[PDB]
Design a protein that fits this description.
The protein is α/β, with parallel strands linked by helices and about 200 residues long. It has one domain (about 1-198): Leucine-rich repeat, LRR (right-handed beta-alpha superhelix) (Alpha-Beta Horseshoe), CATH 3.80.10. It is about 35% helix and about 20% strand. It has 9 helices and 9 strands. Helix 4 (about 90-95) packs parallel to helix 5 (about 110-115). It is elongated and about 65 Å long. It starts with 6 loop residues before the first helix and ends with a helix. The relative contact order is 0.09. Interacts with OCAD2, a outer arm dynein heavy chain. Interacts with tubulin (previously called p45) located within the A-tubule of the outer doublets in a ATP-independent manner. It holds the Pfam family LRR_4.
């Protein structure tokens, strides 16, 4: 369990605790992070040598290195926790491929940005603000996004609204190309035929 203070301490701690090979590496493969993360001086410097960030379980209490994460492009993460929003803006502005199996969020700006990104995978995300999250989450534009785990979508209908979203994509096809393709089930050729045909 490496903490999150300075760049020398953050990487040295990650090399002695998580036993990883950051060293300002363009691609770092860590496992777990520290929940009180706030000042990422390492991100600020490693930003020059930053491109792919890989993690497994990381809680985020705060985040001051938004510009540091503002240069990330690939994010290999499987579980992360976030309550406020102070990084998803720049992170969503520069990220391209965000892989997040589990991720809990509760900020309208964070969700709108991370979803506004290019392609993202969320099989276990935590969002319950259906009111704005539903459409405000780039629902009518979002390029590629996988959503198969959350109270919002599960509130609509576990496996009854997901496929419905697919029919809305094939019919209302505005910008988004892969708005949660999990429920595709090769039925878009039939469901969208009965929904788009009539």
């Amino acid at each position: 369990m490496a903490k999150a203070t300075t760049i020398k301490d953050a990487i040295r701690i990650f090399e002695e605790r998580k036993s990883v090979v950051a060293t300002e590496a363009e691609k770092v493969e860590l496992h777990g992070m520290i929940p009180p993360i706030e000042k990422m001086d390492a991100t600020l410097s490693t930003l020059k040598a930053c491109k792919h960030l890989a993690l497994s379980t990381n809680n985020i209490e705060k985040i001051s290195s938004l510009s540091g994460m503002e240069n990330l492009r690939i994010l290999s993460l499987g579980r992360n926790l976030i309550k406020k929003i102070e990084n998803l803006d720049a992170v969503a502005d520069t990220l391209e491929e965000l892989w997040i199996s589990y991720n809990q969020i509760a900020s309208l700006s964070g969700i709108e940005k991370l979803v506004n990104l290019r392609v993202l995978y969320m099989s276990n995300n935590k969002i319950t603000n259906w009111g704005e999250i539903d459409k405000l989450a780039a629902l009518d534009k979002l390029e590629d996004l996988l959503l198969a785990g959350n109270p919002l979508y599960n509130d609509y209908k576990e496996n009854n609204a997901t496929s419905e979203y697919r029919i809305e994509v094939v019919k209302r096809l505005p910008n988004l190309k892969k708005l949660d393709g999990m429920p595709v089930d090769v039925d878009e050729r039939e469901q969208a035929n009965v929904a788009r045909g009539g």
